[PDB]
């Protein structure tokens, strides 16, 4: 489906916003492993800090 009718609010509200980002989730494992490693580095890994 289009971005409109896939959203709760009025379609024309999308006109008011300057830039609209569709943050789709990609289920590719390369990205999943990287995100998990990053998020663990966040959680007591103390690497990111």
């Amino acid at each position: 489906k289009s971005p409109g009718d896939n959203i709760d609010f009025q379609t024309t509200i999308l006109s008011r916003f300057d830039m609209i980002f569709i943050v789709k989730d990609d289920h590719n494992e390369e990205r999943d492993i990287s995100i998990a490693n990053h998020v663990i580095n966040i959680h007591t890994g103390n690497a990111n800090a």
Binding site: I33, A36, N37, V39, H43, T44, G45, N46
Partner: protein, 92 residues
């Protein structure tokens, strides 16, 4: 008094588990398991270490946290979607 931590030695398994959770979840397609579930696994691992008065989180605490998270996620699914318990996530 007890503020536990983890160490990078226990990164590998957790990442793989997260991936598996994702892939059995989109195959089912009923419930999204996002990065929030990985960060809930981490929190429950910290709690498991806290009840043992430990200052670092052992791999057994991580295993117990993973078991709790996967059991809660599985029991919130449909009977048709519940297969992930019998033959997908039976390893955990």
């Amino acid at each position: 008094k007890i503020y536990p931590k983890l160490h990078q030695m226990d990164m590998d398994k957790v990442s793989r588990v997260y991936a598996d959770l994702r892939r059995e979840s989109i195959s089912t397609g009923s419930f999204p398991i996002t990065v929030r579930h990985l960060e809930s696994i981490l929190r429950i691992a910290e709690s498991f270490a806290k009840m043992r008065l430990s200052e670092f989180v052992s791999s057994y605490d991580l295993d117990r946290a993973i078991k709790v998270v996967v059991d809660s996620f599985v029991d919130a699914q449909k009977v048709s979607v519940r297969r992930q318990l019998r033959r997908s996530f039976a390893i955990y």
